[PDB]
Amino acid sequence: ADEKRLLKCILHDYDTAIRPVQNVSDVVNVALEVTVVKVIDLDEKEHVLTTNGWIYHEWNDFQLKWNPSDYSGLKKIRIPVDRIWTPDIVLFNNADESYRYVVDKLAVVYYTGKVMWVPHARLRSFCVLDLSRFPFDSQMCTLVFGSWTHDVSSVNVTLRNQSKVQYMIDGKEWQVTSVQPKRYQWTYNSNENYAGIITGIKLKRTSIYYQYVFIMPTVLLAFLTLLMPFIPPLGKERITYGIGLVLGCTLLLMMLSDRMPTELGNVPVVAAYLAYVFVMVAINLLFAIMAINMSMQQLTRVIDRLLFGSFLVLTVVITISMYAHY
Amino acid sequence: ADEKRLLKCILHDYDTAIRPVQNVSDVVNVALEVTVVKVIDLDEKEHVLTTNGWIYHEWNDFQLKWNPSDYSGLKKIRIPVDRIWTPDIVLFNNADESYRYVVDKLAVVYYTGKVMWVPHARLRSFCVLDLSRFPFDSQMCTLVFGSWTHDVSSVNVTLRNQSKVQYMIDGKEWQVTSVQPKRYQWTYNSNENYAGIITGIKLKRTSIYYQYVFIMPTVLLAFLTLLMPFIPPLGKERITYGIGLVLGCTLLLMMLSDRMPTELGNVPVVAAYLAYVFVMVAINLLFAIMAINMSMQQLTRVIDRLLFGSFLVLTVVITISMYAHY
Amino acid sequence: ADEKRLLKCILHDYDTAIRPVQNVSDVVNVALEVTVVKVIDLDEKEHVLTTNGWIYHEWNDFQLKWNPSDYSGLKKIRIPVDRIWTPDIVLFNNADESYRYVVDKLAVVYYTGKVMWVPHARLRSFCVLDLSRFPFDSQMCTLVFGSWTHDVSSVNVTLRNQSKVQYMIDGKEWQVTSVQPKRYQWTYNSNENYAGIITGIKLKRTSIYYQYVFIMPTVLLAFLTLLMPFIPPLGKERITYGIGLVLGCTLLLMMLSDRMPTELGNVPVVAAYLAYVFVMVAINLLFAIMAINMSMQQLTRVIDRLLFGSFLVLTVVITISMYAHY
Amino acid sequence: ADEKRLLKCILHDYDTAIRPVQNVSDVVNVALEVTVVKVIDLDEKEHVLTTNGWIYHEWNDFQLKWNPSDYSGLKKIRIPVDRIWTPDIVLFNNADESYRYVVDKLAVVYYTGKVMWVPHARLRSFCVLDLSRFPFDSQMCTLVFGSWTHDVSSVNVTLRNQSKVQYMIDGKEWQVTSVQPKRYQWTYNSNENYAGIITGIKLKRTSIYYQYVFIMPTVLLAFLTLLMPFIPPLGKERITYGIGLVLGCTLLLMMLSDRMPTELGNVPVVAAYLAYVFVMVAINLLFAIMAINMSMQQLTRVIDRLLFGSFLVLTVVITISMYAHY
Amino acid sequence: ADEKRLLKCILHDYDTAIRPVQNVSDVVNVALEVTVVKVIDLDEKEHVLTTNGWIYHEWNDFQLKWNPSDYSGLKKIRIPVDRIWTPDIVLFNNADESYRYVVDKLAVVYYTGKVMWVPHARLRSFCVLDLSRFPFDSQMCTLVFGSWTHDVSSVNVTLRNQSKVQYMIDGKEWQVTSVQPKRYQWTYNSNENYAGIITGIKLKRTSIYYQYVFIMPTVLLAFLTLLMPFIPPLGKERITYGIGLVLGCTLLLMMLSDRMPTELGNVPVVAAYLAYVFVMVAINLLFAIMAINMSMQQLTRVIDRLLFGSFLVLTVVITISMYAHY
Ligand SMILES: *[C@@H]1O[C@H](CO)[C@@H](O)[C@H](O)[C@H]1NC(C)=O
Ligand SMILES: *[C@@H]1O[C@H](CO)[C@@H](O)[C@H](O)[C@H]1NC(C)=O
Ligand SMILES: *[C@@H]1O[C@H](CO)[C@@H](O)[C@H](O)[C@H]1NC(C)=O
Ligand SMILES: *[C@@H]1O[C@H](CO)[C@@H](O)[C@H](O)[C@H]1NC(C)=O
């Protein structure tokens, strides 16, 4: 019954609310180390990013102190979080309604007072997404941790001394690159001062699904539109061909609107290209109608030749411009 | 060993339900200050607005009275909400099934009794939206707080003394402007009266998603329907081209219905425009079928000339009318 | 103080399970008064109706009593439900997995056992919806409450003394009419007798999106189908016109099915009209194929004239028949 | 008070974990009676069935032994579930993460010791659906209950002595037919054995939406495909009309895939019919293209006449075979 | 009354945090065995696998020890886990926000200390999808359990003495094949040592939904696109028929993208085949336009004959190449 007597002696008058400090004026240097292990989802409909990971907490505890020489060693003791003081550091921009936790019900404590508590959670946060380069984009995400209840006058949110956590987690659909965290002084008001720890996650859209399913049909229908003027106006299918392109392009517009989120910043390049081929269809149908109703000598040959050349040059320049980004 | 002494000597017989007032007949002038920090979503499908923010409360505690002179200063103390009396003020029209909380497990207390409890939560509320101006609308939202358990005979929901809280919080899809809150005399019944705190949120749609997705294709194919009747009846393509507009406009109606909500006030201007180009296609198909039936001397020239002119003038007037909004 | 000693004296041995009655054989006249404040949704996919509101609970408490006269009055005391006996009155047809409560952790009680506990909740209930008149329907909804643990031999479940609760809270998408509640003698089994309190809500469909998204396109597409007999079969576009209507009607049925739910009673009028216009496309394509086969003497004039007349007259009679509902 | 004396003297040493048995080797006779009152939904996408119901139990309590003669009657006592022993009966195929209950916080108890502990809940069970006979299907599926925690050495899991459970819960969208429950002696291994209670539900799919949304469009387009071959190849509309059927049938396939679940056993007959008419379109387009190719004397009259005859007879025979189930 | 005596004697000083070991340095050999009873679903959109199953634990307890000979046998005693020390075994890749359990609040223990805790849960794990063979794939995926709180210095996560768990749980939509679990030494860092238990599952997609939904329409439209170039360019329907293919393929791509998940690694063969028939329709529209505008002697017969030969041979070779694997 050794651990039992340790629990009895060290839970003598231990309240779970008192600040674990020796001097009331002094603060406690609380360390933090966030580490994401995998990305689950990135839903741009609400700019929500859900990735699982673990947070590493350190703080020396004044009352937690004992000698292992006469206590048969056993320097590491596992104590549930409910019976021990718990830091209040949370995510500023959590997306979940309640800040839930996973297997965060047990923490290890050392004889000196060092506590290697390692909570794990599936963090859901918000980050700003640059949809202009979509899908060939490099949208950064930011994960920021800090305390809202107490201020710097209580605790000192610092970084780990050892920062050898420069890993690269590449997935089958998204590439995650870690960024060295920094400490910034958040300001809550003029009188009171706060603190925060920011870390960066490079998101690389390595999933071929988006570009392969979207841009390929758009460029194909652009190819079809490029060939419209070769059809003679008398074929009675020129208008039908163009209106078929109209229906197809509306179909791609609808699917893109279903997929590409309502919460939008700058216009996406794929949406701009689709709208550009859409006005392409508008203009070339207009010219086809002009040719056919002018027919009823037919000099439409020069007209649609210079027409075709103009669309050749403009389509090739827009295609190279959009390809230069990738 | 001092803070523990304060907790031992100040929580002697402190219940979690007794009103913290000295005179039983007297009420407490409880303060309130809400502040939204970021907008998450505005789903008009149920008129739900989800924004994260923080609420600020103040009330002097008669029981929690002591002097910092003889207790070695330390006027700032952190006590969990579970061990202290808690105001019951909540939000009237919350959308969540349970009125959840985030990091609302610790509050600060002073020597006088000044308690700056700062809960944070992602509030989901309801407010009426003016869809007549959709998507170029500036639909107000209302965030309102009050007490459902007790009435003015118990507390006094007042505002923060500092009212210069005019901040400019803009997002990537909406821009948010704060309005200074006001206190109103709510009436639960004839005998008893309650208080309410109401604040206004200017939501201005800065997202470019709606316009590019809906209006541009619709307006350009409205232009196409404007220019369609130049096709001769004998070309055997007027019916096909018009029915292609029929299919395309039905697809646009489908996507708008999937997006534009069921809960509707006045008809949206975009929906009205789409229905009007739909009846446009109906009418010009009518006229084209009548003309082709009559053809099978050349009396259709005047008919479709006046047709084209009349639809030019009505299309230009409707376009300027809808553009006058923005 | 005064409140503290009163709570100490009145919560000596008050269990949260003993029936608050003086005579064991006697029952307690528990009164209920439900009041809806706003409607959230009517999801006909599972015939679920979600509306927020508050319930007014009344019962006596012989065990809990005092004399305020010698105790400086103060007859109004707020006590959380966790420390007081609580009726088990629940909704019969709740949709949530757990019958949750909102800000119902405090109840006001007076001196002579007339506690005024007012729980609030967003009730999600089940009620039959009459889709035969959709969208011009008046689907009644029913909210029924009672006790399932104990029977009339324990409690009463009566109504409030005054019934002046005839409020007209109509929304921007639904019109809500309250109906005065009634008490009915529910039976739990043959041996035991129970009670139920039922209130009715008249739901008037005032949403305009439904009709402007469904009836207008179907009615004008039926109109367009009425135009096709004028086109000569030899024009090679009559078949194209008919197949275009076929595709349009298929799309129309598709998003109608996507919107109009699976759980259904009598067939909706819009579905009947859609099936009708499908029957028209079938019949008139049949006759067009017959005419074109005959052409490739010219007696189709009388045939399609009588076809056109019969179709127009029966279409107009069914349209006025369905218009008679609204 | 008297009931307070009962509670004090009957929970003197009552733990909420000890088996309520007198003899250690003896087991306790627990009964079961499950009754469904209203089905919520049947989502075949995950083979989940949400039905609202209640569960009735019987077990004598050795501790709850006393006589009402000396205690002034009072043979009906209300005891909350938290302070009393409860069986661990659980549905084997629940879908909710937690075995949630509704108003399961109170039970009755008598001097004999019988308990009408009757929780109500919305059970989301897993049961197999035979989609081959859609919509003319009679798919039985079952709810099975048991004790996964403890084994037969503790309890008995029997049925009610009175099995007068011949009640039919009729609905406007689904008909529920109850089957008498059964008991099986589950065998894990030589050392451990279990038990299970079975209730069977006949699901009559009385919803009329499914037929009007799926069979009607498919059969009408089958009629059009059957009657198309009269269109002469020289009309230049046969190919367009057939490809219009292609588009329509693809749209039907897409809507069926959206509705008819991914989790599938045998192919649905409606899906088979749609695929068969779609390959019908493919085959007769093949023949039409071959005929128009060989056109440039008209030998196609006999060819497409025998085509029409063969395909009409096969279509009518497959339709009557499909309908012969009823 | 002996069971209560046993509980009183064996729960004297049993805390829920003390490691249940005799020697503090010594660890406890904890054995584990996971077993899936039924798979719910495999959603590749988020790479989530929902499988109903149960976990089997083994560990001795130094404190829990008694002689059944002097206590009238009764070596099997059910105690809830809320009062007994419990290992913190957790899935590494759980998808649920909370690692919830189903009816796992009771465990029977033996006199020797051998514990039969039998938790059941709906495990939501992460699975990697090798969608190269989609849908005819054999995507194995794994479930791994470990101790994230404490390390090997506390307990030893081992396996059972026997591993005769070679069961074949076939479903109507998916075939589940268990794989013998293994033990791998997870490393939290260089200094500390952790452990992990891994199990694998062969997932055979026995569902016939995907093939009938996607491959049959794709293959037959590819066949008819193969056979279409027999249409003469002057028939005025070749362009119309090709654009009909364009529209149909666009709808099919839309529905496939809506169904086939966004989270993708390598391209599925079905999506590749659809894109390749898109390339096919683009190419033959190119050549059809070339033929029609070169018609305005007619040597296009050789051109489209060799065209037809080239596409037939490439299509047959690619189809047999993709079919040979299955
Ligand atoms: C504590 O906060 C101080 C603020 O001056 C900061 O510089 C540092 O990161 C923290 N730790 C120390 C004492 O170095
Ligand atoms: C409550 O606050 C109000 C400010 O609106 C002010 O009249 C006074 O301080 C208090 N009086 C009451 C009890 O209304
Ligand atoms: C409830 O009390 C009322 C008092 O009017 C009485 O009529 C009845 O006995 C009680 N229960 C019923 C059946 O309403
Ligand atoms: C209890 O189960 C036993 C078998 O263990 C069997 O006789 C019967 O089904 C049940 N009835 C009783 C009380 O014997």
Residue numbers in the entry:
A (entry chain C), B (entry chain D), C (entry chain E), D (entry chain A), E (entry chain B): 12 to 307, 414 to 443
Quote the paper.
Cys-loop receptors are allosterically regulated pentameric ligand-gated ion channels (pLGICs). Each Alpo4 subunit is composed of a β-sandwich extracellular domain (ECD) and a transmembrane domain (TMD) made of four trans-membrane α-helices M1-M4.
Similar results were obtained from the sample prepared in LMNG without CHAPS, reconstructed to 4.1 Å. No residual density was observed in the ligand-binding pocket in the later reconstruction, supporting the assignment of the 3.4 Å map as an apo state.
